[PDB]
From Swiss-Prot:
<feature type="modified residue" description="Phosphotyrosine; by autocatalysis">
    <location>
        <position position="161"/>
    </location>
</feature>
<feature type="active site" description="Proton acceptor">
    <location>
        <position position="129"/>
    </location>
</feature>
<comment type="similarity">
    <text>Belongs to the protein kinase superfamily. Tyr protein kinase family. JAK subfamily.</text>
</comment>
<protein>
    <recommendedName>
        <fullName>Tyrosine-protein kinase JAK1</fullName>
    </recommendedName>
</protein>
<comment type="subunit">
    <text>Interacts with IL31RA. Interacts with IFNGR1. Interacts with JAKMIP1. Interacts with SHB. Interacts (via N-terminus) with IL2RB and IL10RA (via its cytoplasmic domain). Interacts with FER.</text>
</comment>
<feature type="modified residue" description="Phosphotyrosine; by autocatalysis">
    <location>
        <position position="160"/>
    </location>
</feature>
<feature type="domain" description="Protein kinase 2">
    <location>
        <begin position="10"/>
        <end position="279"/>
    </location>
</feature>
<comment type="function">
    <text>Tyrosine kinase of the non-receptor type, involved in the IFN-alpha/beta/gamma signal pathway. Kinase partner for the interleukin (IL)-2 receptor as well as interleukin (IL)-10 receptor. Kinase partner for the type I interferon receptor IFNAR2. In response to interferon-binding to IFNAR1-IFNAR2 heterodimer, phosphorylates and activates its binding partner IFNAR2, creating docking sites for STAT proteins. Directly phosphorylates STAT proteins but also activates STAT signaling through the transactivation of other JAK kinases associated with signaling receptors.</text>
</comment>
<feature type="binding site">
    <location>
        <position position="43"/>
    </location>
    <ligand>
        <name>ATP</name>
    </ligand>
</feature>
<feature type="binding site">
    <location>
        <begin position="16"/>
        <end position="24"/>
    </location>
    <ligand>
        <name>ATP</name>
    </ligand>
</feature>
Length: 280
């Protein structure tokens, strides 16, 4: 079985990244024992979260798209084995490559994120975690959606999935329905995409991050009152400002991701056409 990675041959090299419950490591699968084996990215949990990882593995095993990270297999306790992309995420790549990545490349990356996301939605799934940290860089010409840790299936003939465990949520990327009722629609991922586009256009600058910008708008002195204050700001019609050097035509497309009601938001296909017209 080419998708079965034996524990004895999966050699840990170094850490790539870490979250609250999981971590990704660079390993080499070396059955020959001479360091000629293929490098792979391995996701595992820190010592039920085990059940969630098993559902995440089965989602990725069945996704096939040029802008979705490639599933390679499993190591059985279970580890998810995937292709290794040495450039890492946009969050680490963009601050180090501003000279190479111009506006034309930023908009092509935006089209690619939209294509991967439209494919996920056609498979009846809602991501719930679309942010620059979850987009990997294949090359200066290609990006891939690189994590599916919070992904849920939407029931047939239903418009949304309700999440009970909303602990450690990326609130500054969440649409009003997610914050107010814990409801996740395909239109909620469109809202998240608008915030990821803002990150891409600022080259993931820490000082102008969505969290930093919203906290200036609401006040960084609230604590447990932060989310209510965020909801009030959005209900008032306030939104993230236009990124520096971002043309108005691009900002207007970003604004279409942030219509208050999910049913009024632009689709991923409408965004692709919008960006393709600006690229011509
Ligand atoms: C999407 O990334 C993550 C997802 C979950 C976690 Cl827990 C950490 C990262 C992460 N943090 N950082 C800083 C870098 C990461 N990842 C890579 O560099 C990487 C390279 N190839 N690859 C393939 C699949 C997944 N990740 C990678």
């Amino acid at each position: 079985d080419p998708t079965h990675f034996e524990k004895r041959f999966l050699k840990r090299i170094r850490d790539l990244g870490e979250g609250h419950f999981g971590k990704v490591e660079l390993c080499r699968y070396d059955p020959e024992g001479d360091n000629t084996g293929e490098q792979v990215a391995v996701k595992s949990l820190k010592p039920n979260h085990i059940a969630d990882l098993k559902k995440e593995i089965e989602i990725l095993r069945n996704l096939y798209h040029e802008n979705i990270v490639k599933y390679k297999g499993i190591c059985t306790g279970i580890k998810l084995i995937m292709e290794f992309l040495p450039s890492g995420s946009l969050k680490e790549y963009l601050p180090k490559n501003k000279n190479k990545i111009n506006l034309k490349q930023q908009l092509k990356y935006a089209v690619q994120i939209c294509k991967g996301m439209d494919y996920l939605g056609s498979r009846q799934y809602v991501h719930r975690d679309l942010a620059a940290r979850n987009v990997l860089v294949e090359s200066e010409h290609q990006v891939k959606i690189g994590d599916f840790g919070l992904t849920k299936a939407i029931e047939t003939d239903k418009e949304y999935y309700t999440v009970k465990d909303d602990r450690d949520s990326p609130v500054f990327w969440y649409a009003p329905e997610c914050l107010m009722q814990s409801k996740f629609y395909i239109a909620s991922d469109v809202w998240s995409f608008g915030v990821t586009l803002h990150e891409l256009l600022t080259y993931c600058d820490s000082d102008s991050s969505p969290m930093a910008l919203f906290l200036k708008m609401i006040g960084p002195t609230h604590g447990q009152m932060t989310v209510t204050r965020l909801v009030n700001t959005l209900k008032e019609g306030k939104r993230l400002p236009c990124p520096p050097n971002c043309p108005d035509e691009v900002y207007q497309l970003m604004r279409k991701c942030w219509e208050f009601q999910p049913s009024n938001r632009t689709s991923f296909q409408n965004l692709i056409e919008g960006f393709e017209a600006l690229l011509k």
